[PDB]
Write a protein that binds this ligand. Structure first.
Ligand SMILES: NC(=O)c1ccc[n+]([C@@H]2O[C@H](COP(=O)([O-])OP(=O)(O)OC[C@H]3O[C@@H](n4cnc5c(N)ncnc54)[C@H](OP(=O)(O)O)[C@@H]3O)[C@@H](O)[C@H]2O)c1
Ligand SMILES: COc1ccccc1NC(=O)c1ccccc1OCc1c(C)noc1C
Length: 314
């Protein structure tokens, strides 16, 4: 099951999220990405930020080498980190990600976030006062450098992540625009369903890709512990009993039926294999309306520090 992107390429509508906290050994990304491919996942989501592209690339090469899959069957996504927004850094950043993953191309390269940070070796450059150091970059020049990555064939498609409507319009109205973003990867789930942003993206032929669609990893560092737990929600549990499914599968199916490509992270073999059952059932129109009613503008990403960035999207 794929959606056609506005540049003609195809994207599988169910994707495997690979980010795990640094508590988790790097070897685990290799094992679970292999399990995801074996379970039926063909869309694999990574990023420079995740510090796992070598292991994710090893898992793809492993399933190609053993005969399970051809490179053409895999949709591999990586992302440009915010310290590399300056145009001269974009292509070397992609080529470095390609070198780590040991691939000739990525199916999708994204601007990970509109909030530019100080260039350097640190993912989170921090000044003498403990504050993250912002950078000011014309994101239209970042996009122009992204377009040349597609030109050269290092990325089959290019898109963005964590952009709001204002930010998307900035790229769409850029003079001399060569490629529109094929997608906007944003936090999206029943508590924060982005119905207006999704409507805007549909109007522009841009796919909305939902992360944290299962309610996030509730990382102790960011997520508020008193924030509601999505997978324990009463309405999702009622529908899970009605359909003889699980709350996670109801959340995933919800996005598929509203036209949203959905990611799903799991490092647990049984839950990885369970998640591809999203294709085995259908929610009713009344089911969808009940899930729509859960919307409460709750984002699991919470940061006092970035809330002051000029490009903060919320
Ligand atoms: N562009 C961005 O800024 C951005 C931001 C965040 C995430 N992402 C990407 O989106 C992917 C997913 O987002 P996320 O990190 O917030 O995780 P998620 O997809 O929302 O899942 C959250 C938790 O749900 C659990 N889970 C998975 N399947 C389950 C099932 N069938 N039943 C019960 N629980 C289940 C998982 O725990 P277990 O591992 O124990 O199964 C997982 O930790 C990430 O890996 C990343 O690739 C992108
Ligand atoms: C600004 O975020 C970071 C800056 C430095 C280091 C890390 C991060 N962000 C994350 O590790 C993260 C983790 C879980 C969910 C969501 C997360 O980020 C969401 C996001 C938004 C909103 N805008 O950009 C991003 C990225």
């Amino acid at each position: 099951q794929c959606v056609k992107l506005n540049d003609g390429h195809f994207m599988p509508v169910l994707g495997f999220g690979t980010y795990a906290p640094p508590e988790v050994p790097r070897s685990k990304a290799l094992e679970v990405t292999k399990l995801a491919i074996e379970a039926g996942f063909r869309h694999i989501d990574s990023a420079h930020l995740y510090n796992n592209e070598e292991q994710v690339g090893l898992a793809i090469r492993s399933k190609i080498a053993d005969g399970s899959v051809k490179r053409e069957d895999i949709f591999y996504t990586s992302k440009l980190w915010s310290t590399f927004h300056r145009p001269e850094l974009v292509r070397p950043a992609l080529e470095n990600s390609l070198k780590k993953a040991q691939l000739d191309y990525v199916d999708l390269y994204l601007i990970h976030s509109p909030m530019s940070l100080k260039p350097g070796e640190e993912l989170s450059p921090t000044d003498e006062n403990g504050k993250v150091i912002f950078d000011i970059v014309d994101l239209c020049t970042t996009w122009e450098a992204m377009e040349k990555c597609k030109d050269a064939g290092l990325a089959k498609s290019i898109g963005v992540s964590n952009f709001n409507r204002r930010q998307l319009e900035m790229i769409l109205n850029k003079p001399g625009l060569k490629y529109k973003p094929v997608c906007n990867q944003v936090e999206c789930h029943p508590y924060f369903n982005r119905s207006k942003l999704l409507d805007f993206c549909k109007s522009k032929d841009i796919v909305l890709v939902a992360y944290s669609a299962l309610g996030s990893q509730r990382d102790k560092r960011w997520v508020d512990p008193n924030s509601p737990v999505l997978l324990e929600d009463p309405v999702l549990c009622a529908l899970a009993k009605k359909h003889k499914r699980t709350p996670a599968l109801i959340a995933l199916r919800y996005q598929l039926q509203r036209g949203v490509v959905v990611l799903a992270k799991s490092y647990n073999e049984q839950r990885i294999r369970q998640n591809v059952q999203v294709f085995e059932f259908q929610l009713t129109a009344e089911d969808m309306k009940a899930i729509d009613g859960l919307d409460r503008n709750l984002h699991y990403f919470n940061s006092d520090s970035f809330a002051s960035h000029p490009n903060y999207p919320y």
